[PDB]
Every structure is written in structure tokens, then in C-alpha cells.
A and B are shown apart, each in its own frame.
Chain A
Amino acid sequence: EVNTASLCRIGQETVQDIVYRTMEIFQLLRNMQLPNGVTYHTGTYQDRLTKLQDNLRQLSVLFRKLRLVYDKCNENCGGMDPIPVEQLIPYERREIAEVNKKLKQKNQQLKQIMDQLRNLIWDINAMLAMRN
């Protein structure tokens, strides 16, 4: 209904991905060789501009989503209207605990399976001395 925490996480992921996309497109257009290649007639630059436009659309929709989530965050001002900045320096959850215990049991089971898989998977280290 609110998902403000997930909204902030998505916004952070989006701005990080925007920076990543900037770096990637710089690395991409870095080796922009002569379009009129001696050997290559029309091969490279086509896919180059294709990926260029793709990354452009990507960063455009990224900016759009950023603006949208920022507007959503700044509009839904519910809870702690004062919001004391000086309140960040120190001097039911039953279902959560049940899900955590179930996940831990599944993790231990998977770990036992992986432990068995270790011995079942080495399988060559002991007998590579005479393997062919």
C-alpha cells in the first residue's frame, strides 16, 4: 500500500544503474572507429548505433522512473511530520520469526546437500594420478 522503503531502495538502485549505464556507454562509444572501415563495410556501426539508442531509451526511462519515485516519496509525507534530524545518534513479528526459522532450516538442509555434493563431486582429485 505504501512500500516507501522498497521505493527508496528502487530509487537508489535506479540512480546507481544510471551511473553504471553512463560508464558503460562511455566505454562503448570509446572505441568509435572510422565508420567507413576498410574491411568492414556496414557491420559494426549499425549495431553500435543500435546499442546507443537502446542505452538512450534505457537512461530516459530511468530518469522518468527517478522523477516518478521522487514525486511519490516527496508527496506521501505520512508519519513524523517534524522528522527530527537529531534523532539518529544513540548514546506482529511472529510470522517474520517463523519464516526466518523455516528459511534457516531450508538453508541447513541445502548446506547438508551441498556438503554431500562436495565429496560426490571431487571424484577426480583422488584418482587423477592414473586417469588416462
Chain B
Amino acid sequence: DFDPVQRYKMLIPQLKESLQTLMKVAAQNLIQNTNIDNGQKSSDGPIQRFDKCLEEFYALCDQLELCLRLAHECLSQSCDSAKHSPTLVPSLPYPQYLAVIKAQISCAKDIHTALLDCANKVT
């Protein structure tokens, strides 16, 4: 029952903090190998392999993108429906709505057939 936009809003801080933790563990691994290769036995602290954090970041990014795309598709559909269909949600009955929809579908198919015949005659 969660709305998309509010979920995105509440999830932005998650992506922020995950990127922060990602950079942190990256710096940890960097200083670890930098003290290992040329320094001495000082960095003895097993941190995260930096794989899980990156994968989680990518997954959260992908989920946010999915939610945004879904919201955009829904609003675009609502907009085009409102713009190319009157308000009839029972001053017209539902069968009239279905009939109008079918008639428009048939008109679009007829237009498509006419254009195909024009292309055929062109060739």
C-alpha cells in the first residue's frame, strides 16, 4: 500500500548512506593493501570484500529506477486517457465506453490498413 513517490523519497537516504559506506569500505581495503604490500603487519582487520556493498548499491539503484519508471508509465497513461477520453465512469454507461473503445480500435486498424495499402500501391 506504499506509494511510489513517497517510497523513492524515503529511500533516497538509503542510497546516500549505502554509497557512503561503500566509499568507506573501499578506502579501508585500499589502506589495508597499501600497508600490506610495502609496510608491515599492521592492518589486521577483516572488513567487507566490497563486492556485497557494490552489488547492494546497484540493486537499490535498479529498484529505484524500476519504481520511477512504473510511476512515469502510470501517470503518462492516466494523462493520455484523460486527454483522449471524456469522463464516463458509472455520464455514459460502461457498455457505451467499451463500444467507443472498440470503435476507436477499429478506426485505428482501418487507418493502419489504409496506410499499408498506400505503401503497397507505392511499391
Q: Note all chain A residues with C-beta closer than 8 A to B86.
A: 38
B66 within 8 A of A: no
Closest A-chain residue to B117, C-beta based? A56
With known contacts A56-B121, A60-B121, A36–B101 Cβ distance under 8 A: yes
Q: Is the interface of B mostly helix, strand, loop or mixed?
A: helix
Interface readout for B77-108 with A: 1 if CB under 8 Å, 0 if not? 00000001110000000000000110110011
A113 within 8 A of B: no
With known contacts A49-B110, A49-B114, A56-B114, A36–B121 Cβ distance under 8 A: no
With known contacts A56-B121, A60-B121, A35–B114 Cβ distance under 8 A: no
Closest B-chain residue to A52, C-beta based? B114
B74 within 8 A of A: no
A112 within 8 A of B: no
Q: Note all chain A residues with C-beta closer than 8 A to B103.
A: 35-36
Closest A-chain residue to B92, C-beta based? A38
Counting contact residues on chain B (CB < 8 A from A), the size range is 10 to 19
A52 to B107, CA, bound (A): 13
A36 to B114, CA, bound (A): 18
Closest B-chain residue to A64, C-beta based? B121
Q: Note all chain B residues with C-beta closer than 8 A to A53.
A: 114
Asked if A34 and B121 sit within 8 Å, CB to CB, the answer is no
B118 within 8 A of A: yes
Asked if A35 and B107 sit within 8 Å, CB to CB, the answer is yes
**B residues apposed to A, CB below 8 Å:** 84-86, 100-101, 103-104, 107-108, 110-111, 114, 117-118, 121-122
Supply 15 A–B pairs (Cβ within 8 Å), ascending by A. A34-B85, A34-B104, A35-B103, A35-B104, A35-B108, A36-B100, A36-B103, A36-B104, A45-B107, A49-B111, A53-B114, A56-B114, A56-B121, A60-B121, A63-B122
